Write a protein that binds this ligand. Sequence first.
Ligand code: ATP
Ligand code: ATP
Ligand code: ADP
Ligand code: ADP
Ligand code: MG
Ligand code: MG
Lengths: 91, 99, 247, 592, 298
Amino acid sequence: TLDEYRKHLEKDAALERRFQPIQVAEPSLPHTIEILKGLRDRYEAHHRVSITDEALVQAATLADRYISDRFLPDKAIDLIDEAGSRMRIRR
Amino acid sequence: VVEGLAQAIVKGEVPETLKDKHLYTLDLGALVAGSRYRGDFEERLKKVLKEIRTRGDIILFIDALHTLVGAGAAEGAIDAASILKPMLARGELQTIGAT
Amino acid sequence: SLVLDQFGRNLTQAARESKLDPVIGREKEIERVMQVLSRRTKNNPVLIGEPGVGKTAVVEGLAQAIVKGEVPETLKDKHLYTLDLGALVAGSRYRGDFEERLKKVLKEIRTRGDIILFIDALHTLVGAGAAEGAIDAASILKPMLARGELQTIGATTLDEYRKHLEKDAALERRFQPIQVAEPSLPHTIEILKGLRDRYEAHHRVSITDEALVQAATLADRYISDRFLPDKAIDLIDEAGSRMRIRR
Amino acid sequence: SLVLDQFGRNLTQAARESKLDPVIGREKEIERVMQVLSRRTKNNPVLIGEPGVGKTAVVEGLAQAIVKGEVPETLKDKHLYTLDLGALVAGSRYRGDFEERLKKVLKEIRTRGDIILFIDALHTLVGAGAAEGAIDAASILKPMLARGELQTIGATTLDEYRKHLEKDAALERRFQPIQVAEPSLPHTIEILKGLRDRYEAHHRVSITDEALVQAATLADRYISDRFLPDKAIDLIDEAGSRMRIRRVAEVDGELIAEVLATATGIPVFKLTEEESSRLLRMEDELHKRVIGQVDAVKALSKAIRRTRAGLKDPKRPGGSFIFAGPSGVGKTELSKALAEFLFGDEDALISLDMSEFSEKHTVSRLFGSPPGYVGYEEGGQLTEKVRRKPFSVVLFDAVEKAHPDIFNSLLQILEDGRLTDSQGRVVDFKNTVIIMTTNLGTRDISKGFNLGFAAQGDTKSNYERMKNKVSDELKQHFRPEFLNRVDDVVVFPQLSQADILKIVDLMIDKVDERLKDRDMGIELSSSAKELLSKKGYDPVLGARPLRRTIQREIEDSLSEKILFGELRPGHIVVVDTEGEGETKTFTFRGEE
Amino acid sequence: DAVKALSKAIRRTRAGLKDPKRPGGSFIFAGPSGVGKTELSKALAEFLFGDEDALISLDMSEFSEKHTVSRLFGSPPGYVGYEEGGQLTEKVRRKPFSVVLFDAVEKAHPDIFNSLLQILEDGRLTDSQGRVVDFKNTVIIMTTNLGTRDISKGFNLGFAAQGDTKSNYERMKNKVSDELKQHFRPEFLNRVDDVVVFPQLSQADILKIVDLMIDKVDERLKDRDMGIELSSSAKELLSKKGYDPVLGARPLRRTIQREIEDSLSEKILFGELRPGHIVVVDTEGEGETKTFTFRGEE
Ligand SMILES: Nc1ncnc2c1ncn2[C@@H]1O[C@H](COP(=O)(O)OP(=O)(O)OP(=O)(O)O)[C@@H](O)[C@H]1O
Ligand SMILES: Nc1ncnc2c1ncn2[C@@H]1O[C@H](COP(=O)(O)OP(=O)(O)OP(=O)(O)O)[C@@H](O)[C@H]1O
Ligand SMILES: Nc1ncnc2c1ncn2[C@@H]1O[C@H](COP(=O)(O)OP(=O)(O)O)[C@@H](O)[C@H]1O
Ligand SMILES: Nc1ncnc2c1ncn2[C@@H]1O[C@H](COP(=O)(O)OP(=O)(O)O)[C@@H](O)[C@H]1O
Ligand SMILES: [Mg+2]
Ligand SMILES: [Mg+2]
């Protein structure tokens, strides 16, 4: 994590000449849609349910807009898995 | 700069009383590793110190001496500067630091 | 005596080996040290002096006098041992770790019975091992210091003494202050004259008297944040090092 | 007793071997301790007192009384054990070790049934084994202490009692405080008489009764940072050590006075013939540097002679003077001369400039900031300086340039000889000399007549008019209560023409002394001195135009000659004069 | 009058008729300089406990700024010096029965005494740590010289027939009352038990004080095994020489020192007066040329 890296890995002067940093940025909303489409097959197979693209895009938008504590590349997956669990438990 | 000084010593472009005096660098990783508590810490440092005292012509470069000095502000920190206090008072070894 | 050697240094033995620089013109302070050390109670001298003056120098001179020279009774053939409080408190993480080492050191000192302790850089004793449950070194040492059982010599600067030791009226009672004044120009001149030989032996050069006079005067004039008996010696050392590196 | 001896010391056994110093005059405290120890419940006395008084001596005397069998009622052949908390905490790095040791000690005490515990520095009992904070020594000891078992005696200072022991109200509840007061002078003399035998035995010397009386009186009067029983013994011990290192010998009051004088700096040592002769001619010594001003020199000499003859008021400073006079007359010079006479160097004077004390809040520089404010830790500037040097000269220069309300703080200095800084400490000004310099009423030194038509002309000496005007101005400026405490108010007469020649001689001597460092010298003829005196009379501005004239008439020419290389080391420049009237001018000539 | 007031307060306290919710007594000693305002407090303390050293004395010249009041309470929580507590509160708590003296009350800021209200009415004071220290067994004395600036005044501005038949005491009492009402709030003056005005000293008072001052000088001399004895003429001359109705008995002290101690010091330094000897002082001459003569004696 960035905060841990700057707080602890920066002071290790011995390894400063041996490590190189590579930054990873948050995924954009189209990237989130792509990841959701990629995971559609596995999650539908696990939950024994069917999900549509409109659900994907609305879940991504709701996660981006109305959720702040968690972050996009995981919370949309969490929401769709949660919905799949809800559909599984009612039958 | 440290290895520049070492190279200048190696080719001999260095004043007397230092033209045949070896230079070594010390890292805490080797001495800390393989130890359970501070009882093993003192044994290794005292052994290497008596070894260099018998040798008598070793310059010790301790990079990140800032960790050595300021290591008493939290639990689990190893503050060896006081451990490295007495002999430096006698000055039987030469040390080089960077901070 | 290996216990004290682990946590400190022996001064009389080193002085017997001529490993200590000679001291010049400090007879009054060393005599006052003997005066305080011979008291029946509270015989613990403390040297209050600003950095640079010979606070350690007078202790080294006293050690040399004990090795050879005029020394009264009840103080002859004693062993002067310097103890470091910083190394004593290091490595203590559990309950009672710090107290055990200090108790062992005091037991060794009592068993030997002929040791005078020197706690360099005093005023750190007030907060030595002051944990929430552990008792500090001051509380342990107070009964022996007040009854004269333990003989110790401390050194500190005036500001440290006033802002840390004067506030603690209990610990301040058990120490007798001794003032060390900054040497005058002739005193520094003769000190440099005495110390010239060791530096000439160390750096293979020669130092003239006018060089010493100029060093003393210029260090006294152009430097104010340091003090005379040290900056002149630093100037001489720097000149010797520069002459060595040039050749 | 093996486990009990492993963590404590038997005081009764030591008292049986005469290893404890005798205790004198503590019958009431020991009786109260015994009375408290006999209670059914909460029989745990604690002695709270200032550091130095015999708090531990009371317990030692109780142990000696138990050994001697003087103690009646239940306390018969009881064993008093001093507990060592350091041994209990030593080691015990694992859970349940310190608690186990304390439980074992308590079980041993309960089984034997005739053990009385003594815990020196009871304030350390609050935190003993609180590795995380829970079961410590106090929590274990609370029930037995409350129910009446485990009789215990504690000792603590007032500051430690308030700061630490009162943070645990449950533990403080189970103790009955007892006040140990500082002994008076006769009690201190009795204590010194009691301990004389032991101190003579240790120091291998002999001590007279006069030595003990002098030590007690001088320690009570002059040394004010500690308390009576200890600081009196300190003088005797220091004198014994000083006599021992010099090698039966003898210790008298003179040695004690010398020891105190060298410890504190106050000259209380015995008078000598040479010193008495020097004091009797102090006016000449002061006149070796200041010309004229006979009244002020006489007043200063009288004050110093009163101080050194043992006739000064022991509750007021040595002297208080108001030097009122015109500019450049010798007030600051006289103060510097007095400082040089008293201490050997004129830079030992404590000089305070009232030119910068214009704001009324600047009085905070005298004694420091109140609690809770910035700079509170650095308590006082004047008080700190006076505390380090009890015997010194305090000078308030140009008091008319400061706010009038600043001097109210001197009301307790001139009359009571004390000043309290904001931290609560009291610094005594009873051994200092206070001088305040001013130029009030010395403005219009002219007009030897009165405005308007007059018939007789009512001639009067300028000195009398100056004196009356200064008195009126002082009455107008300061409050009556402030002026009522000043010992002497002296007016400096204006400098005369004759004194200018002597001042010129002194200035030329100073110039020659400065010049002799470079192997030089200067000589003058009477004509040159007369010309210098005539050229710079200026009766209004004092002797400052004289320095300016000497600087820009002799220093510049010598400097130019040195720069040109006209003269070399080993030369003695002789200066004469030439011309007449306005043509009079100096001429320089080399010599060897 | 002041001695009667103090004795009445002490007797009422000891007889058991004291109000158990207020201090033993509260007095405002107002009067000119050098009349015995502080001397009476020291004498009361010496009579009470054992000496004048048991007095709790505050010099109000240091409380010039209104933010110094913390020296009575201590710093509030979260500020430097909070753990030290108050300075007056601690002293009173460690000695519940004592005499508290406020010297030169008019030279402090007129807000510090706002903190005395609860002291003078409820007999309590709270420090910054919340602890209550009671004052119900103390005696409060406040000394001042307000309204005494016009003692050396002959008449008022304007024409007037005959003159003021009232002595200096009545005029000074009225002036003190007016100045006290002007300087302090009514609620503060409503809590003070007694206000005592000190009249000036007469010639007989100076003659009597001469004996006490000579006794003090004799004690100082006896400290070196000596002594001094004066004749009646010497005492009368000393009383006549030093006497000013405005400045009290301090000019008498200055006159005594100048006319006795300087000569004694000169004689001791020279060697005429030595231990084991006493000095006898007599008078010579007549009229305004009368002077002192010192004679040694075993
Ligand atoms: N009576 C004197 N004897 C010797 N030197 C004197 C005398 N009066 C003045 N001087 C010389 O004049 C110099 C200036 O006088 P000084 O500093 O004493 O003045 P002051 O009385 O303090 O006046 P000011 O009110 O201006 O401060 C002194 O340093 C000294 O060299
Ligand atoms: N009535 C008196 N009886 C005896 N001595 C007195 C009397 N009045 C004054 N003195 C002497 O004069 C000295 C100074 O008087 P004191 O300190 O009592 O004055 P004060 O009334 O408090 O005035 P100030 O307003 O100046 O503080 C006393 O120490 C004492 O020696
Ligand atoms: N009286 C003296 N005679 C000779 N050398 C002295 C004397 N006093 C001080 N020195 C020299 O000054 C140097 C610095 O003194 P130091 O021991 O550092 O004093 P401190 O520890 O109080 O600063 C020492 O190396 C010592 O050789
Ligand atoms: N009543 C007394 N009789 C004899 N000596 C006393 C008495 N009171 C105090 N002393 C001496 O005072 C010295 C210091 O007292 P101390 O026991 O240190 O008191 P505290 O422990 O309270 O500081 C002791 O050496 C003791 O000899
Ligand atoms: Mg001046
Ligand atoms: Mg008064």
